[PDB]
Amino acid sequence: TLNMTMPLSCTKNNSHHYIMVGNETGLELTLTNTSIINHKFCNLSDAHKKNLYDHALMSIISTFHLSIPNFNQYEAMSCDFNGGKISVQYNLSHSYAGDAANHCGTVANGVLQTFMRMAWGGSYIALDSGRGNWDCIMTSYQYLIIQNTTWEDHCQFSRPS
Numbered sequence: 001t002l003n004m005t006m007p008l009s010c011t012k013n014n015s016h017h018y019i020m021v022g023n024e025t026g027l028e029l030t031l032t033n034t035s036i037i038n039h040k041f042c043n044l045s046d047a048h049k050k051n052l053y054d055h056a057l058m059s060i061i062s063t064f065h066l067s068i069p070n071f072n073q074y075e076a077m078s079c080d081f082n083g084g085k086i087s088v089q090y091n092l093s094h095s096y097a098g099d100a101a102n103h104c105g106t107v108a109n110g111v112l113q114t115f116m117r118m119a120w121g122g123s124y125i126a127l128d129s130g131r132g133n134w135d136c137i138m139t140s141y142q143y144l145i146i147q148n149t150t151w152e153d154h155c156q157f158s159r160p161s
């Protein structure tokens with residue numbers, strides 16, 4: 001065992017949902033005030049890391065039917081790799097209306113949107129964006145964390161690195 005055992009994803013204070021892409025593998029989406037990736041980097045230095053990254057986000061967009069509007073906006077994002085299993089952390093700026101509106105055309109916002117509409121946990125506020133069905137979602141959560149993990153382990157945070 002390397003370093004000390006990781007905290008739980010499934011907590012009384014967290015909102016979480018699991019997307020099962022593979023036969024038992026998938027993505028654990030966690031909305032938290034707990035930071036998992038402690039650096040400011042997302043180094044996709046090789047084609048494999050870039051490929052693992054695109055597959056993770058493609059999975060979320062496909063499953064949630066995210067039609068993300070082009071607002072030329074971005075979420076603060078860290079990523080790391082642990083033997084082929086990616087971790088993606090969004091430092092969400094959705095705590096205030098103005099902040100949410102400027103980080104509205106993002107995957108993280110699409111996830112927040114699904115959590116709200118599916119009632120998966122947590123309370124949110126929907127701001128009418130400029131276009132159709134897309135809402136800018138407010139949340140008090142600081143982090144959205146996405147980890148490639150198994151169903152047996154989805155309730156515990158994986159090691160980022």
Ligand SMILES: *[C@@H]1O[C@H](CO)[C@@H](O[C@@H]2O[C@H](CO)[C@@H](O)[C@H](O)[C@H]2NC(C)=O)[C@H](O)[C@H]1NC(C)=O
Nearest residue numbers: 035037038039040041076077078079089090091
């Ligand atoms: C998201 O916010 C956390 C918290 O501020 C950032 O983690 C910090 O990273 C710096 C390195 O630049 C460390 O010196 C701090 O100790 C970290 N703080 C904590 C609480 O872990 C994280 O880097 C941010 N991620 C992004 C993408 O901005």
Ligand SMILES: *[C@@H]1O[C@H](CO)[C@@H](O[C@@H]2O[C@H](CO)[C@@H](O)[C@H](O)[C@H]2NC(C)=O)[C@H](O)[C@H]1NC(C)=O
Nearest residue numbers: 038039040041042043044045078079080081161
């Ligand atoms: C992500 O990449 C950056 C830059 O590619 C890394 O920062 C480098 O770290 C080395 C330490 O060996 C130092 O020379 C500098 O801090 C950076 N070098 C250059 C050329 O930018 C960073 O450590 C990487 N982090 C992760 C998690 O992969």
Ligand SMILES: *[C@@H]1O[C@H](CO)[C@@H](O)[C@H](O)[C@H]1NC(C)=O
Nearest residue numbers: 013014015032033140141142
């Ligand atoms: C997360 O932190 C924000 C700001 O500190 C706070 O308002 C919010 O209630 C916290 N949420 C949880 C679930 O701890």
Ligand SMILES: *[C@@H]1O[C@H](CO)[C@@H](O)[C@H](O)[C@H]1NC(C)=O
Nearest residue numbers: 021026027055056084085148
């Ligand atoms: C998790 O990682 C494995 C290999 O590291 C990959 O085959 C699989 O597609 C990944 N799962 C998701 C949901 O990205």
